[PDB]
C-alpha cells in the first residue's frame with residue numbers, strides 16, 4: 001500500500017534530479033566560463049545542445065526503448081546519467097562538458113517518456129492524478145529550489161562539485177530504484193492527425209516563439225546580472241530563487257483566476273513578458289528594479305506556461321500523451337533556440353541588448369496569441 005506511494009515519490013525525486021541538472025547550467029555559466037577561459041555566452045551552446053538533443057531524440061529513443069521498459073531500462077538510464085555527470089565533474093575542455101551534457105540529454109530523453117508512463121502504473125486509481133501532481137512537484141522543486149542549491153554548491157566547491165552532488169543524488173536514487181523497482185515492463189499513430197489540426201499546430205508555434213523570447217533573455221541572466229549590471233554573484237543567486245517564488249505565485253494566480261480567463265491570462269502574461277524584456281536593461285541601473293522585474297517575469301512565464309499547457313490539452317483531448325510529448329519537444333526546441341539567439345546577440349551585439357532583442361519574438365507571440373485565442377476559444381474545466 002504505502003509501498004506504491006514510495007515508488008511514485010522515488011520517480012518524483014528522479015524528476016527533481018533530471019530537471020535540476022537541466023536547469024542549473026544557467027546558474028553556473030560564469031564559473032564554467034572562467035574554468036575554461038572563454039565567454040559565458042559560448043557556454044550558452046551547452047544550454048542549446050542539451051535542449052535540442054532532448055527534443056529531437058526523445059522520440060527515436062522512446063521508440064527504440066519500447067520493448068523493455070523494465071527496471072532494466074531505468075537502471076541502464078541511471079547508470080548513463082551518473083556517468084555523464086561524473087564526466088562533467090572531470091571536464092578539461094568545454095568540448096568535453098558539451099559531450100557530457102549530451103549524455104545527460106539521452107538519459108533525460110528516455111527517462112521522461114518512461115517516467116511519465118511509470119508514475120501511474122505504480123500507484124492506485126485515485127492517485128492516478130495525484131501521482132502526476134507528485135512528479136510535477138519534483139520538477140517545481142527543481143526550478144524553485146534545485147537550481148539555486150546547485151548554484152550555491154558551485155559557489156562553495158566549484159561547479160564540478162555542483163554536478164558531482166547532482167550525480168550523487170542520482171546514485172542514491174539508482175540504488176533506491178533497484179531495491180524498489182517492481183520488475184515492471186504505443187500512441188504514435190496519433191502523430192499525423194495532430195500534425196493536421198491547425199489549432200494544435202498553431203499552439204505549438206506560439207509556444208516555440210514565446211519560449212524563444214524567454215530563453216533568449218533568461219539563459220544568460222547570471223552573466224547579465226554580474227557582467228552588465230555590475231552586481232554581485234550572490235545577487236544572481238537571489239534572482240534565481242525569486243524567479244522560483246514568482247512561479248509559485250503564478251501557479252496560485254492561475255489557479256485562483258481559473259480557465260475562463262486562460263486565453264486572457266496568457267495573452268496578458270505575454271504582454272507582461274514584453275514589458276519585462278523591454279525594461280530588462282533599464283531595470284539594471286538599480287538593484288531593487290531588477291528585483292521587481294524578476295517577480296513580474298516569473299509570475300508571467302509561469303502563467304504563460306500553464307495556459308499553453310491547458311490549450312494543448314483541450315485542443316487534443318484524444319492524445320494527451322503524444323501532445324504533451326510534442327509539447328515538451330517544441331518547448332526544448334525553443335529553450336535551445338532562445339539560448340542560441342541569446343548567444344548570437346551576446347557575441348555580436350552587446351549582451352546588454354538581449355532583453356531588447358527578446359521582445360521581438362514576444363511581440364510576435366502577443367499578436368499571434370490574441371489572434372488565435374479569438375479563433376478557437378476552447379479550454380478545460
Ligand SMILES: CCCCCCCCCO[C@@H]1O[C@H](CO)[C@@H](O)[C@H](O)[C@H]1O
Nearest residue numbers: 054055058059112139325326328329332
Ligand atoms: C512524440 C514526438 C516527439 C516527442 C518528444 C517528447 C519528449 C521531450 C522531452 O520532454 C521532457 O519532459 C519533462 C516534462 O516536464 C520536462 O521537464 C523536460 O524538460 C522535457 O524535455
